[PDB]
C-alpha cells in the first residue's frame, strides 16, 4: 500500500504536495537540494513519518451511513446540501449516480437535477417513504423506477448466500414439510387492502433491511466457529497471567580512573570524650582574622564565575543584522542537513553505500570552504 518506505519516497506528487504548503520544510529543501545538490531520494529518507502523516490525512474516508434519512427538507422550503453529502448519496445509492452521469451536463444543469430528484418519487422510495399515487413527482426521474426494481432483485441475489444452520430460520419451517393446521389470523400476516393486494408497508421494511445489509457488506470489501460460540465461558478456568519475573544481582566493579588500627579509634574517641565532658567553648569558633580573608577570597571567586554564568542563563536578542543573521542561519541549517545523512550511511555498516559516503564527504568539505 501507499504507506511504506519504498512507495512514499517514489511518490513525487505527495512530496510536492506537503512541500507546497509546508513552509519551513520548503526553505530547507530549496537550499539543501536546488543549490547544494543533495539527492531528493536521500532527503526524504529521514522524513518518512512526515510523508506518511500527510498521506493518511487524505487517504482515509468516513464509514457508510444512511444519508437520505438525514436529508430533511424542512410557501418556500429550503434544504442544504454539501459536496461531502453529494458523494455519500452516490456511494450509498448507485441508481442516483446512474441517472446523474448520463444526464448532467447533457440536457440541463446539476442544481435542477437535485431539485428534480427530490421532487421525484425515486427519492421518496429510496428514503423509505410510502409512495403516494396523488403525488405528481417528476416525469424524467420516474423513468428509472423500473430500472431501480431490477437493481433490487440484483441486490437480493448479491446478498443471498447460505446461512449457518445455527440461525437458519428457513430450516425451522421446513423441519416438517407436511404440517397441516389452521391458517394464522390476519394480525399475523402482511396487511392487505379491500382489493386484496399488498398494502405496500412490507416493501419499506425490506428496503430498510436491504440498506443495513448492503452497508454491513460494504465493510467487508477487498481492503469450529460454532463450537466456541455455544461454549459457556463463565464456567471455564479464569485467565492466568504469564508475565516474566526478573531478579537483579547487584555486584559491580569500583570506579577506576593509611588505614587506622582499632586502638587508634578508641584512643581518639577518648580524646573527644574528654574534650566534650570537661567543657565546650563555642566562642573559639570565630576565626583568627587571617584565614577569614582567605576563606572569603576563594568563596567570592566562585560567586563571580557563577554570576557571569547566571546573568545570561522565542530567541535570544542578537547583535548581527537581519540580512547577515538569516544567511548565517541558512548556512548552519544546510550544513546540519548534510551531517545527518552522512552519519546515516557512514554509520550504516553496509559497504554497499560506499559511494554515498564519498559523495556526502564532498559536500561537507564544501561546507568548510563555504563557511
Amino acid at each position: 500500500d501507499s504507506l511504506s518506505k519504498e512507495k512514499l519516497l517514489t511518490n513525487l506528487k505527495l512530496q510536492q504536495s506537503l512541500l507546497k504548503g509546508n513552509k519551513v520544510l520548503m526553505k530547507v529543501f530549496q537550499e539543501t537540494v536546488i543549490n547544494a545538490g543533495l539527492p531528493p531520494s536521500e532527503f526524504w529518507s529521514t522524513r518518512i513519518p512526515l510523508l506518511r502523516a500527510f498521506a493518511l490525512s487524505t487517504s482515509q474516508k468516513v464509514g457508510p451511513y444512511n444519508v437520505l434519512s438525514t436529508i430533511k427538507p424542512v410557501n418556500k422550503v429550503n434544504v442544504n446540501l454539501s459536496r461531502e453529502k453529494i458523494l455519500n448519496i452516490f456511494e450509498n445509492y448507485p441508481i442516483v449516480k446512474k441517472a446523474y452521469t448520463d444526464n448532467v451536463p447533457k440536457n440541463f444543469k446539476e442544481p435542477e437535477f437535485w431539485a428534480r430528484f427530490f421532487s421525484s418519487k425515486l427519492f421518496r422510495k429510496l428514503r423509505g417513504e410510502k409512495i403516494m399515487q396523488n403525488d405528481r413527482g417528476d416525469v424524467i426521474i420516474d423513468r428509472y423506477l423500473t430500472l431501480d426494481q431490477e437493481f433490487d432483485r440484483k441486490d437480493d441475489d448479491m446478498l443471498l448466500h447460505p446461512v449457518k444452520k445455527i440461525i437458519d430460520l428457513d430450516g425451522n419451517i421446513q423441519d416438517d414439510p407436511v404440517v397441516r393446521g389452521n391458517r394464522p389470523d390476519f394480525t399475523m400476516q402482511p396487511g392487505v387492502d379491500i382489493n386484496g393486494n399488498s398494502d405496500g408497508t412490507v416493501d419499506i421494511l425490506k428496503g430498510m433491511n436491504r440498506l443495513s445489509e448492503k452497508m454491513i457488506m460494504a465493510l467487508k470489501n477487498e481492503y469450529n466457529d460454532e463450537r466456541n460460540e455455544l461454549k459457556i465461558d463463565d464456567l471455564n478456568e479464569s485467565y492466568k497471567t504469564n508475565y516474566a519475573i526478573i531478579h537483579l544481582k547487584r555486584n559491580a566493579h569500583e570506579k577506576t580512573t593509611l588505614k587506622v588500627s582499632n586502638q587508634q579509634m578508641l584512643q581518639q574517641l577518648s580524646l573527644v570524650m574528654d574534650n566534650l565532658i570537661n567543657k565546650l567553648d563555642l566562642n573559639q569558633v570565630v576565626p583568627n582574622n587571617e584565614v577569614s580573608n582567605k576563606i572569603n577570597k576563594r568563596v567570592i571567586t566562585a560567586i563571580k564565575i557563577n554570576a557571569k554564568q547566571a546573568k545570561h542563563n522565542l530567541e535570544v536578542k542578537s547583535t548581527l543584522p537581519i540580512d547577515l543573521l538569516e544567511s548565517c542561519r541558512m548556512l548552519h541549517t544546510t550544513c546540519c542537513e548534510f551531517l545527518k545523512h552522512f552519519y546515516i550511511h557512514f554509520q550504516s555498516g553496509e559497504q554497499k553505500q560506499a559511494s554515498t559516503v564519498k559523495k556526502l564527504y564532498n559536500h561537507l568539505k564544501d561546507c568548510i570552504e563555504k563557511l
Binding site: 446461512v163 440461525i167 430460520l169 389452521n182 402482511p190 433491511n209 465461558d233 463463565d234
Partner: protein, 196 residues
C-alpha cells in the same frame, strides 16, 4: 413521523419479514453489526420465527423491549371455541388462559438474552397491563422484578438503565462469587457433605 430517522443515527435497523430466508439474512447482519461495534436494532414479532429458538446472548442481546402483551386475536373463531372447551372440561377461566398464553410468550422472549451468569441485560415490559402480571412471570424473573419497577415511566426507566449498565461494566470481585454462585470441585464436595 420521522422517529426512524433518529434511530438510524445510532443503530442499524433490521426487521423480521415473512420470508424465512430474508429473516435469516437479517439475523446474520444484525449479529455482524453487534460484533463490529456498529450497533443494531432488531424489530421482530413476539410470536414469530425469531422468538421460537433464536437467542441473543452477550453483545447481541443487551436490551429487550416488549411492546405490549403479546395477546392473541380475541375475535377469532378458533380461539373462542378452544377457550370454551377448556372452561367446560378443565375448568380454566377464559381470561386466565388468555393471560397465561400471552405471558408465556413474553417470558419466552425475555429468557433469550442470558447464557451464563456473566451475561447481563435490561428487560423492559412496556404496557400498563404488565403491572399486575408480576406473579404470572417465571419465578426467576419475578424475583428480579422489584416493587419500585412495577410501574415506571420512560424517563425513569432510562435513568435506571444507564445506572444499571454502568454498574455491570465494572470488574466483578472474584471473592464475591467464589462459592456462592459458582462452585469448584472442592465446593461441590462441601455441599454434598453438609447435606448428608
Amino acid at each position: 413521523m420521522g422517529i426512524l430517522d433518529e434511530v438510524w443515527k445510532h443503530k442499524l435497523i433490521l426487521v423480521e419479514t415473512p420470508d424465512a430466508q430474508e429473516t435469516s439474512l437479517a439475523l446474520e447482519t444484525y449479529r455482524k453489526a453487534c460484533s463490529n461495534g456498529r450497533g443494531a436494532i432488531l424489530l421482530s414479532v413476539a410470536r414469530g420465527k425469531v422468538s421460537e429458538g433464536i437467542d441473543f446472548d452477550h453483545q447481541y442481546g443487551r436490551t429487550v423491549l416488549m411492546i405490549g402483551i403479546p395477546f392473541q386475536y380475541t375475535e377469532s373463531r378458533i380461539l373462542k371455541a378452544r377457550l370454551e372447551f377448556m372452561r367446560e372440561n378443565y375448568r380454566i377461566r377464559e381470561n386466565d388462559f388468555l393471560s397465561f398464553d400471552a405471558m408465556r410468550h413474553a417470558a419466552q422472549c425475555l429468557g433469550r438474552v442470558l447464557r451464563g451468569k456473566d451475561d447481563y441485560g435490561v428487560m423492559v415490559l412496556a404496557d400498563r397491563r404488565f403491572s399486575r402480571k408480576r406473579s404470572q412471570l417465571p419465578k426467576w424473573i419475578a424475583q428480579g422484578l422489584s416493587d419500585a419497577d412495577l410501574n415506571l415511566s420512560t424517563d425513569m426507566a432510562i435513568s435506571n438503565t444507564k445506572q444499571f449498565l454502568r454498574t455491570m461494566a465494572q470488574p466483578t470481585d472474584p471473592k464475591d462469587q467464589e462459592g456462592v454462585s459458582v462452585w469448584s470441585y472442592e465446593d461441590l464436595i462441601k455441599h454434598q457433605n453438609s447435606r448428608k
